[PDB]
Design a protein around this nucleic acid. Structure first.
Lengths: 134, 119, 222
RNA sequence: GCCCUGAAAAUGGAUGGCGCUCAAGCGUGUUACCUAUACUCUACCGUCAGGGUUGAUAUGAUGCCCUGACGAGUAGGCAGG
RNA sequence: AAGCUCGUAUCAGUUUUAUGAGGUAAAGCGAAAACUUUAAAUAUGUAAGAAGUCCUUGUUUGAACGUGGACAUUUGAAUGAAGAGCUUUUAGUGGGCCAUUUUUGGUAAGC
RNA sequence: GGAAUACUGCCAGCUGGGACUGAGGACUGCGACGUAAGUCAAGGAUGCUGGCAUAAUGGUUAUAUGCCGCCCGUCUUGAAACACGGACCAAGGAGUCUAACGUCUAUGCGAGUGUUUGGGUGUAAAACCCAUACGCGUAAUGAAAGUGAACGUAGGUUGGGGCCUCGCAAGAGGUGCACAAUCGACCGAUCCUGAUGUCUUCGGAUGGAUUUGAGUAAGAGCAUAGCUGUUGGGACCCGAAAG
């Protein structure tokens, strides 16, 4: 349970504004989860590798699904091929951004995701490995 | 009477030494000469378990869970019938209710008045 | 901005039917009540004229008011006053009479005045101090939309419907009853009688069961 | 059942006092009246809870609005000034 | 509270039912008080459905044990209702009088 | 025999007197009275009339009158009183700095991270720029020599926020992140088994049974700042006998 972020990013505050409006006047269980995720502290938003995304895109029925991470997307070297997809996130590191946009895909932000899917249709949310550490 | 690890029994001694005498617990050991029960005691406002070691003849099985089973089987029967036809069957129990109106008759029964007695 | 006249006409026509439905319902409830009462009178007369005795039905519904304060209560009397929703003094509730609730009523006897309420006192309580619990919040009733749109899934769509479901213990007594927030009465206007209150009503006090004078108590405490 | 005796000292004194005798004493019944930060109704302050509002241009979105129940406090804790 | 996994129709200093325990007669009545045939409580434990029922039967037919489908929420008493469970650790506290209700032992009387 | 009255109860019966309050601020709603437009006591007070415009009302202040209130702080949690401090005034006067570890939050980059020991430059103890090294992290386990992480779609079953499909819903089916439970697979330690073979004793293939570890089973860390915790430094402040 939280109600306002403890951060001081004015851009993050604008994101919270937008997604509070969407959560209030759309009635879809997607915005309600992303707004909650926009409140967590840094230790509770583990980074999501670029290969966990590929691992997720292999599930049967996930050809053109838009994959959404609400934290940071980091690179990976142990994987070699990469599908052609579109990922939405807060931040992409240099390596992960280069890999995605070089394999043909696209790297977008969260507000553009909200405008290409006001209710989060044909999407798929990913969470990082919490307790690989303490 | 032969007991297994896990069954339920009550303590009943056939003098002044110790008095649980009417509790109910689970057998957590069965040795050759005795049996062992545990009992959750209210330690102020917590339930801490005491492990007692009774004897054989000072313990008997319990029937505190026979009515539940018999009622579930009667309910199986009633619900078999309630699917066999379209019937309101009202399986639930009901607490005892207040009585209804009546008309007593003083034909062979004339009311006999009686006053209290002296000293 | 369209829908300028059709909406007003349609809503004013839709309300004019619910009004007639409520008219019919009440006109029937009244006949039922008076017929039952007159029948009981005549049955007593017939037993007397036939040389016999006619006993009535045990009362199905009691009204309970909390009389003593909140200090120096033991725990088992202290928990029944919570399960009865009697949280502060001079608060009242209805209670169905069964062998399961009579023991409750006998466990907290030294702290309550309870008895058997009549149509007039039920009606006055609901018309003056009636407040519903709507998702929370002790909302005054004051209107039929409030009752219908929160208690209508059980055929209750007015306030005489509620009074009926309470006075003749129907199938949805539990739901209708937990709808009503507990009543907050005041002290009695003429006093109590009884120099001292905490003796038995039989023995010249207030607590316990009076069975018929709860009406004279609550009509003044109201 | 009331009433007397049914032991108890020492500066002058205590149904709280004055006083009270078909009582202003004792046992009881019926009423009327006085009175708390307790109960009821209404306003104002705050706290908590649930709903609305991005609709531009309008005056501040840690805002604006509608509804409800609540308020003792040492050690100690959290927040705003 | 720090905080996060969980408000999950499941819970409760409460009553009712089934049953044990007090067994004191004070029910109440005996085969020549001589019962246990059996109350009313007095607070005393346990139990009251989804980790449940049936069909069908492979191993050390009754014991546990495996199996392949049927079973629906007035889904198995009453009242109330959203504040129970792990992890982190962080602050104060760690020893006392009055009264009532049981119980034991007490003498001038206290206790 | 036929009435009456009393007591108890009900009326969505009528009707006088008194006191306190007037929150809200365009309309919206539920009603009622009328054939009719309209009217109303129906989601919070208006209408009429008089006096004064100043010390009249009100605020402050001194006194009088009615009722109330035992002297502050500290220490023993009670006769809770005792006991200890206080003649009066001004100024001074007590949880601070650091080192090392740990939780929590914010920020930067992220399989990486960290410029400031030093070099270059400078408008000169500032700011800007930088090579090679080094620490922590990316691999664990055994006392030690040492050895050192995929049978498979990185696994099997149950539960699981979302998303997808059929559908108005209600539902039904598909895939299922984090995390949880249970059965397995891989690495090291440990007990056996002992192959193609060789410095005649070397090598340890292969298949096996116990527990075991902060192990692997598509990385999550490094640095800075703030609020705090513990330990050491005189360590919240003063006050004492000593070698």
């Amino acid at each position: 349970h939280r109600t306002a972020p403890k951060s001081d990013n004015v851009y993050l505050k604008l994101l919270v504004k937008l997604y509070t409006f969407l959560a209030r006047r759309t009635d879809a269980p997607f915005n309600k989860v992303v707004l909650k995720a926009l409140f967590l502290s840094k230790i509770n938003r583990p980074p999501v590798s670029v290969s966990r995304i590929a691992r997720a895109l292999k599930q049967e029925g996930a050809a053109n699904k838009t994959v959404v991470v609400v934290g940071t997307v980091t690179d990976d070297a142990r994987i070699f091929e990469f599908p052609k997809t579109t990922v939405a996130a807060l931040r992409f590191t240099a390596g992960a951004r280069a890999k995605i946009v070089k394999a043909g895909g696209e790297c977008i932000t969260l507000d553009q995701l909200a405008v290409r899917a006001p209710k989060g249709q044909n999407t798929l949310i990913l969470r990082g490995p919490r307790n690989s550490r303490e | 009477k032969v007991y297994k690890v896990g069954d339920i029994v009550d303590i009943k001694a056939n003098m002044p030494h110790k008095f649980y005498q009417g509790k109910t617990g689970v057998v957590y050991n069965v040795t050759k000469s005795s049996v062992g029960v545990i009992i959750n005691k209210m330690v102020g406002n917590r339930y801490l378990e005491k492990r007692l070691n009774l004897r054989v003849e000072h313990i008997k099985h319990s029937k505190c869970r026979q009515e539940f089973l018999e009622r579930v089987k009667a309910n199986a029967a009633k619900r078999a019938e309630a699917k066999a036809q379209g019937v309101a069957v009202q399986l639930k129990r009901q607490p005892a209710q207040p009585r209804e109106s009546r008309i007593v008759s003083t034909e062979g029964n004339v009311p006999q008045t009686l006053a209290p007695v002296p000293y | 901005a369209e829908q300028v006249a059709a909406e007003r006409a349609a809503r004013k026509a839709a309300n004019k039917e619910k009004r007639a439905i409520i008219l019919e319902r009440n006109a029937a409830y009244q006949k039922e009540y008076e017929t039952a009462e007159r029948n009981i009178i005549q049955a007593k007369r017939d037993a007397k004229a036939a040389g016999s005795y006619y006993v009535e039905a045990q009362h199905k519904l009691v009204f309970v008011v909390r009389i003593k304060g909140i200090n120096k209560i033991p725990p088992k009397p202290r928990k029944v006053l919570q399960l009865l929703r009697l949280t502060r003094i001079n608060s009242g509730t209805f209670v169905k009479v069964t062998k399961a609730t009579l023991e409750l009523l006998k466990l907290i006897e030294p702290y309550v005045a309870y008895g058997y309420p009549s149509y007039s006192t039920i009606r006055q309580l609901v018309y003056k101090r009636g407040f519903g619990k709507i998702n929370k919040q002790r909302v005054p009733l004051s209107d039929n939309a409030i009752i219908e749109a929160n208690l209508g899934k059980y055929g209750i769509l007015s306030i005489d419907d509620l009074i009926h479901e309470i006075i003749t213990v129907g199938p949805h007594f539990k739901q209708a009853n937990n709808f009503l927030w507990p009543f907050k009465l005041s002290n009695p206007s003429g006093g109590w009688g009884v120099p001292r209150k905490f003796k038995h009503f039989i023995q010249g006090g207030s607590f316990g069961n009076r069975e018929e004078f709860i009406n004279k108590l609550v009509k003044s405490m109201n």
